[PDB]
């Protein structure tokens, strides 16, 4: 029907938003990795626990239930998986 044509241009907009999320995740990942290299090249730790928790908790404050998982992904991409 007419409602199928609308769905196609709503999906078209999701796609553009998916490109944006994905472009920004990449960029974010580059920057987190650099902070890592800059703290580590001067005898610092790979991970900073309070900074990690803060972002995770603020993501939950912002989107709810999935916040921690969303933040966990960005944290894993940016400082690597632990171990």
């Amino acid at each position: 029907p007419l409602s199928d044509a609308e769905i196609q241009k709503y999906r078209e907009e999701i796609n553009r938003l998916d490109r944006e999320i994905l472009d920004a995740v990449k960029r974010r990942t580059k920057i987190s990795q650099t902070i890592g290299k800059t703290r580590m090249s001067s005898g610092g730790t790979r991970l900073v626990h309070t900074r990690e928790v803060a972002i995770i908790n603020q993501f939950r404050e912002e989107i709810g239930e999935e916040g921690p998982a969303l933040a966990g992904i960005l944290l894993r991409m940016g400082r690597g998986k632990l171990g």
Partner: protein, 456 residues
């Protein structure tokens, strides 16, 4: 011949005594200075008492530590830096036992292997000290087996009778550890309940949610599959401490003969014993004592160790090439672990020794803050284990275990964690007789994070 010969047959050991005289005549760092007569007499008493562990337990542990060393299990060791007689109480021992059992559940899920559980307990009463004194020519506290905490001449006299106090406290502590672990404290589901509360109440709860849920589904899956909780209602906790005090460790030497007839010498003050950083001189008492006892052995190696030295310890302490006999405990600092350890591991692996590689991220990361309290930052403690793991993944070797100083009390001793402890928090509940321990929350947080390292 066989049927004739069968009816005819029906109608201080010598090697050990060599090695034992060699060992006793070696120099011994970090000893007290007390009357030789009194000392001997106390050893005579302690030569006759029930040991703290029996030899077949030690043989069972050796089989488990061999699994660890071969990549099939993980070693969790930890507890108080220094036990004291005043604190050697039911609630406190229970607090630590639980914390360690709780950590072990998470680590087992993360390793996908058994975790061997070794408490710093039932004998950790001696400590190394830089000089014999120094404040005002008054003797330094060397732990409750040598003298008292109180800052007076009478309390600080080195007292040999404290070796009997220590044995008695050790005995009581092991009795309780055994009792708790067989009567419900080590129930897997009760412990998971305690982990679930930790997560629910942590200000960093969301850091652990998803691993905690996943563990939970793991538990519920067992029960769904029809698993009887025979294996799951109890667990073995092993004791360990630093073999430090000459007079005490020799007085607990026991001969043990196994099922195939083979006679061995054990120090039965503990299942496992280790040699400190400050006492590991290759010609000295401690390394040579550990070389002549059948107990599994640990050795603390700091950031000055070379690979050449690593190998030679391995040859001295593991001369019959027995997997897990010897555990190499790296305590290098978070900033040194990634530089020093690789070379150590490569030479040792190449020499055909199969040791347990263990991370002690506490003793290389200790510092003195503005207010004068000794402390350790959570992030630096975590980073040393993290770097230890990184090295192992690069070399393709097995990250064997961790050795951490913690308590099941809500202390304020180490900085960081979710509770965000800072310089100003430390004098709230600073209770350690010696080094800054992880508290209950920090200990559980660390188990979740080391769980993630294992899963990688």
């Amino acid at each position: 011949h066989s049927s004739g010969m069968s009816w005819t047959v029906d109608i201080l050991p010598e090697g050990m005594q060599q090695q034992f005289e060699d060992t006793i005549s070696r120099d011994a760092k970090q000893q007290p200075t007390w009357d030789r007569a009194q000392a001997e007499n106390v050893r005579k008493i302690l030569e006759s008492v029930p040991p703290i562990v029996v030899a077949p337990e030690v043989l069972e542990l050796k089989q488990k530590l061999a699994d660890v060393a071969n990549g099939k299990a993980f070693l969790l060791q930890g507890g108080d830096c220094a036990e004291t007689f005043e604190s050697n109480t039911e609630p406190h021992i229970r607090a630590n036992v639980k914390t360690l059992l709780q950590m072990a559940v998470v680590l087992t899920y993360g390793a996908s292997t058994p975790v061997i559980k070794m408490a710093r307990i039932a004998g950790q009463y001696a400590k190394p000290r830089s000089s014999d004194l120094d404040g005002n020519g008054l003797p330094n506290y060397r732990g409750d087996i040598v003298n008292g905490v109180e800052a007076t001449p009478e309390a600080r006299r080195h007292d040999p009778a404290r070796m009997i106090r220590a044995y008695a406290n050790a005995s009581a502590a092991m009795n309780l550890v055994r009792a708790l672990t067989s009567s419900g404290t080590a129930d897997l589901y009760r412990l998971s309940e305690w982990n679930r509360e930790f997560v629910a109440n942590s200000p960093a709860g969301a850091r652990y949610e998803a691993l905690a849920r996943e563990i939970d589904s793991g538990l519920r899956f067992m029960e769904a599959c029809g698993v009887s909780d025979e294996s799951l209602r109890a667990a073995d906790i092993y004791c360990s401490h630093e073999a430090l005090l000459v007079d005490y460790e020799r007085s607990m030497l026991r001969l043990a003969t196994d099922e195939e007839g083979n006679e061995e010498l054990y120090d039965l003050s503990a299942h496992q014993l280790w040699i400190g950083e400050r006492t590991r001189g290759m010609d000295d008492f401690h390394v040579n004592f550990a070389s002549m006892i059948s107990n599994p052995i640990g050795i603390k190696i700091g950031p000055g160790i070379t690979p050449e030295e690593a190998v030679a310890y391995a040859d001295k302490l593991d001369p019959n090439f027995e997997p897990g006999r010897l555990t190499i405990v790296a305590r290098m600092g978070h900033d040194k672990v990634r530089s020093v350890l690789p070379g150590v591991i490569q030479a040792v692996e190449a020499s055909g020794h199969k040791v347990i590689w263990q991370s002690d991220p506490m003793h290389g990361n200790t510092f003195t803050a503005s207010n004068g309290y000794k402390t350790r930052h959570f992030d630096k403690v975590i980073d040393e284990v993290q770097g230890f793991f990184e090295v192992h993944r690069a070399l393709g070797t097995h990250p064997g275990g961790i050795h951490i100083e913690f308590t099941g009390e809500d202390v304020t001793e180490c900085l960081g964690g979710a509770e965000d402890i800072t310089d100003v928090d430390l004098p709230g509940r600073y209770e350690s007789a010696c080094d800054p321990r992880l508290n209950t929350q920090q200990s559980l947080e660390l188990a979740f994070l080391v769980a993630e390292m294992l899963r990688n």
